[PDB]
Design a protein around this ligand. Sequence first.
Ligand SMILES: O=c1ccn([C@@H]2O[C@H](COP(=O)(O)OP(=O)(O)O)[C@@H](O)[C@H]2O)c(=O)[nH]1
Lengths: 456, 432
Amino acid sequence: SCPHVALLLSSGMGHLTPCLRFAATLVQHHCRVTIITNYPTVSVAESRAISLLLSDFPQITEKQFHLLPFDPSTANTTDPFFLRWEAIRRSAHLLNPLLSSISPPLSALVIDDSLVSSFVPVAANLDLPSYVLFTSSTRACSLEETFPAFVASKTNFDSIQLDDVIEIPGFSPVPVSSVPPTFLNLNHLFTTMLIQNGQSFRKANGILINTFEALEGGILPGINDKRAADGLPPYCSVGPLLPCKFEKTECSAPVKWLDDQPEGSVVYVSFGSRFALSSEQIKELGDGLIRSGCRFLWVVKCKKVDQEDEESLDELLGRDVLEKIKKYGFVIKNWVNQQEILDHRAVGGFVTHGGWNSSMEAVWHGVPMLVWPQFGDQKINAEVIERSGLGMWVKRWGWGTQQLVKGEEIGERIKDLMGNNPLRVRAKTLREEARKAIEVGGSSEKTLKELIENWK
Amino acid sequence: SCPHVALLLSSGMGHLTPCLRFAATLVQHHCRVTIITNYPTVSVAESRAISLLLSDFPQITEKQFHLLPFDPSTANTTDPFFLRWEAIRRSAHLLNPLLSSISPPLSALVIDDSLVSSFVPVAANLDLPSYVLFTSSTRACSLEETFPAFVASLDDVIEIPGFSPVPVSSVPPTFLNLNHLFTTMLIQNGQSFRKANGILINTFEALEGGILPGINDKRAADGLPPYCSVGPLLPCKFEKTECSAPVKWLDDQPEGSVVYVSFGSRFALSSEQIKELGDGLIRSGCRFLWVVKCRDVLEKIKKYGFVIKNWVNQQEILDHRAVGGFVTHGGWNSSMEAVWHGVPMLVWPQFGDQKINAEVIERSGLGMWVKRWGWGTQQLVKGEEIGERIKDLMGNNPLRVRAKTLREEARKAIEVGGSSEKTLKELIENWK
Ligand SMILES: O=c1ccn([C@@H]2O[C@H](COP(=O)(O)OP(=O)(O)O)[C@@H](O)[C@H]2O)c(=O)[nH]1
């Protein structure tokens, strides 16, 4: 028997990557997978990732979701990805006929965590087990559930101090300074979407998280015991979700550069796939990389959408400054195979924004991290990484999007990262604890095993 | 629902490759697959292949076949690959306990054509549909089925149902040798094909003309198993590397201006022919990629050509736009690889069924094959004669156009509503 599972995709490599990786896992665990795509993807990368998955996995059916015509002026925000989310959510009543067509009949529908509010009702109509695929950390998933209860308690949500805390069941309380800055702005489309999603998690049959038990410090089994005792869906840890084989082009220019570098001497720098630093911050970060006295691999973005980042790096910095930096380190404004770079033995550290997928890839390859939160769940994530002993988080730098960090300071913190032996040691340990979880008898592999057996 | 299919592997790199590719094809068509391996493999090429297959398809389970101790003294040959077959065949009854323990329940067993007679009774024991994965062409396949009837009865000719009759000159050289352990198998196997539920051939309808439906009509009347066309068998994802030492050389060459010369893993050219073949390439005045299997001009030969003496990725070299022609021994695996990539080929049959396949290639219009050269193992070809024929291959435009035509017919056969996919769907649907 092969349980037919449907994956409902949203938008962004942050969400798309763990969805595709999970699709590949399901397929390799004797399930039938059908992914529900929507075009045109905001970013070119999304399009390529899907074409590469379908090419490698012909046994994966693709049904295209056709959204309703959308007027972006009806939405609060100018963010392309958020806008796309809203388009898909507004087309929710159209998913019902589409699912009925699919044969053989489904056994479970795995929804992206940004669409839960709108599509959990749909799945209920067809008596379909629905599972939330949470793309971030467990502590982040727990704040999302609690945040509706929080704002309801406040008469005036404007006169709220940064010092105030939001208590999370089973986790260390979260300071409002760590809460996504946009949350303080209720009525923003992002906030309204996450308030409604967090209220609907309880309607799902389970919550899938890209994590493993050892990472969380063993607080998870207790939490699930309390959650079950209150009629709440269980936290299902199936991570680390293994990077697919189509993510390893062994002849990349940056990969070839790395082969000519000493072991553990290269600092890899990336701030994700949907965010770009300001002009001033980009200039300062360039300065700080030279000051670090470290070999570095730097992935620059000047705009959120890769499709629109047409300007050359010469324009922002100047050929003078740019040519100078290319002497001390490798700089590239393109899409790089991040997981392929992280596994390379030349890479000794990672300067990241705290995006969960990145952090989990660094856990998987055992690379120390310097987390520099820019927005969203990255501060909550920063703390989780720090408590795992894998990364360091400079709290003095605040949010990246609202505070400028000058070059001199960046250089000194990167030096500390390249010589932080407790981080290196913990990495090796946490890495081996990661492999064990996906091996047979592993904690993660075990949970996925009971999932499929209930499908079935 | 997922049909559980078991693949029975034998030794030989020529038989292994289509076996491993068909295994992947089944997985990609929603089947659970289990392969039966025997170790130690005769070559590292087999071990490497199976390991890379199990590496890229974790869902494919491997249950090893342990065999009875074999006395190589009772052999009628000294070939390592054929010897392994006899070693496997004599321990055939050892497969019933292994096959019954497999979970979930099997719904079909696929056997290599070298093990058909010994292992098709095993299937009957277990109420399992057995299928024969034939590793050569349809024409060669029909010869094997009717050859036992023929010997129960040179310029002579053998009657083949469905095809043009085959001259005995095209029949494998060791078929005329009944003492040989090889011939004894082929005699025993051919008579046993009738017991199997179907014969899987790496081919598509358009390549053989519309004859397969017509043949299967007659085959159904006699109660004979149907000819299942499922080809071409595409190379797996482990059979492609972004860069190779040859490929890097190919990216500096003009389009279609390079001759690829390969004679397979098993066979090796004579020392005498290598010098002759070497001089013919230089005489051809064409850029060439030469594979040598087992020296003052050795450096001067690299002037307009590239030489490598190791395992190469043909499917990579053949897709490449710099390659315009193929000098092949005529193996059906390499031939389909050239069909799929639409590369014109010059067939130079060395042994086995390569003369038979050569007639299949010529009839299709994809290649030319020099009758005057005969068998490669038997007959030597001088340098001046080789170089001349290569130029004919590199200057033949009807060939290049036929290649383009066949390539689309081949590609259309895999896609939905295609020839080969239709038979495959109906096959799996029967299992169900
Ligand atoms: O240049 C890049 C940028 C992104 N990524 C991949 O894109 C994902 C981004 O996920 P993340 O957790 O950082 O969330 P984001 O903030 O980017 O949406 C990661 O898995 C990276 O491997 C990549 O491979 N190369």
